[PDB]
Amino acid sequence: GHMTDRLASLFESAVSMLPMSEARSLDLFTEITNYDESACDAWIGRIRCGDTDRVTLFRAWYSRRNFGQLSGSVQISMSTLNARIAIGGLYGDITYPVTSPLAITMGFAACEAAQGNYADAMEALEAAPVAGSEHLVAWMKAVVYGAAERWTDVIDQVKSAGKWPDKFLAGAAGVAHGVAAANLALFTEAERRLTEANDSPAGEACARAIAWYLAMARRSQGNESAAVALLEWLQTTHPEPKVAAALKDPSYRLKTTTAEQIASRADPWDPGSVV
Numbered sequence: 001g002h003m004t005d006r007l008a009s010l011f012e013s014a015v016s017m018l019p020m021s022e023a024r025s026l027d028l029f030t031e032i033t034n035y036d037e038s039a040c041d042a043w044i045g046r047i048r049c050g051d052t053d054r055v056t057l058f059r060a061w062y063s064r065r066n067f068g069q070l071s072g073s074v075q076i077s078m079s080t081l082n083a084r085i086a087i088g089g090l091y092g093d094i095t096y097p098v099t100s101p102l103a104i105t106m107g108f109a110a111c112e113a114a115q116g117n118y119a120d121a122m123e124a125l126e127a128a129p130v131a132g133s134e135h136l137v138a139w140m141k142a143v144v145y146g147a148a149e150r151w152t153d154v155i156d157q158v159k160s161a162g163k164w165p166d167k168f169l170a171g172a173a174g175v176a177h178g179v180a181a182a183n184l185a186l187f188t189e190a191e192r193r194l195t196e197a198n199d200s201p202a203g204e205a206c207a208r209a210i211a212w213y214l215a216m217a218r219r220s221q222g223n224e225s226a227a228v229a230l231l232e233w234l235q236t237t238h239p240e241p242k243v244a245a246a247l248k249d250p251s252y253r254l255k256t257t258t259a260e261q262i263a264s265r266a267d268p269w270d271p272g273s274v275v
């Protein structure tokens with residue numbers, strides 16, 4: 001009624017304000033969600049303004065049946081907001097544009113995986129058909145399983161990646177396959193897959209995991225000068241405390257597991273529970 005008109009006009013203003021001031025747009029999108037917690041489009045607006053609080057992504061997901069309703073009442077396509085969400089998990093820095101509820105699903109699953117809410121992540125992934133986007137769900141499962149160190153389940157999800165349309169995501173999948181191999185002490189396989197994935201369109205987005213796991217594979221095989229060369233490259237290009245630490249200490253090694261060990265977990269989601 002009166003409130004509908006008010007929220008419409010706040011949304012329209014928020015979108016117009018985006019090139020001028022994300023801070024002011026945020027105030028307006030937040031004013032909408034304060035009055036209507038179900039206003040999916042305004043939760044997405046908040047994400048666009050740099051609000052990636054886990055609750056904001058949860059709310060966008062929870063209100064997903066309202067996607068398009070508020071923006072639609074002022075004739076704005078949600079694609080015009082140019083909101084993006086994180087979907088790379090541990091493998092790389094990969095974002096995806098929020099142009100449909102699929103994006104929200106993927107973002108929510110990645111965020112839940114990061115928080116350790118794996119069943120909730122999986123349940124969101126399986127809540128609806130994916131309608132020509134099977135590879136995207138497989139990718140997100142690889143993210144969720146990887147977060148829980150379920151390396152054999154990662155491989156199950158990405159082993160088919162040669163047949164994916166999206167060559168970027170097929171490349172990312174090769175990184176996941178290589179990381180999973182390394183964590184299972186399949187170091188030669190890890191080196192082949194990570195080297196190939198490095199040539200793909202995902203090589204840059206996944207540069208950190210690619211170099212780290214190559215270095216760890218080389219070190220565990222005994223090839224210390226290769227490991228050091230990769231870690232020196234990392235400290236130059238993507239410096240990090242654990243890279244500095246690994247470069248200074250040759251006993252710094254990847255702790256690996258096996259299919260049998262993963263299967264013996266009292267709780268498959270908990271790498272600490274190996275019986």
Ligand SMILES: [Sm+3]
Nearest residue numbers: 054111114115
């Ligand atoms: Sm999170």
